[PDB]
Structure 1
Amino acid sequence: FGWFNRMFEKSTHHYTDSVGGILRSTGRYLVLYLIIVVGM
């Protein structure tokens, strides 16, 4: 009918594929999770 469309698209390219592109990077989250932990 058409509602699931607004999140089924946001699950793949906007999430799962941008989720590849975060350990495709890794790097900076070593210090971002220490600005977050010691910032906490």
Structure 2
Amino acid sequence: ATMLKPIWFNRMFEKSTHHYTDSVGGILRSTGRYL
């Protein structure tokens, strides 16, 4: 709280987290037998 002040790999990280959410939703669509 004291020393912090507000004032190229980020796009790949955004792509990876979007893919992670997509895969999480896809596997959460059914679950069940995959479990």
Q: TM-score, normalised by structure 2?
A: 0.56
Structure 1 stretches (4+) deviating beyond 3 angstroms? none
Higher Cα Rg: structure 1 or 2?
2
Greater share of helix? 2
- Cα deviation for residue 5 of structure 1 reads 1.1
Q: Does 1:7 align with 2:13?
A: yes
Query: Alpha carbon RMSD of aligned pairs, Å?
Result: 1.3
Q: Does 1:20 align with 2:31?
A: no
Aligned identity (percent) is: 61
Q: TM-score, normalised by structure 1?
A: 0.52
* Structure 2 unaligned regions, length at least 5: 1-7
**3-state secondary structure, aligned to 1:11:** helix
Letter in 2 for 1:20: G
* Structure 1 unaligned regions, length at least 5: 31-40
Number of aligned residue pairs: give it: 28
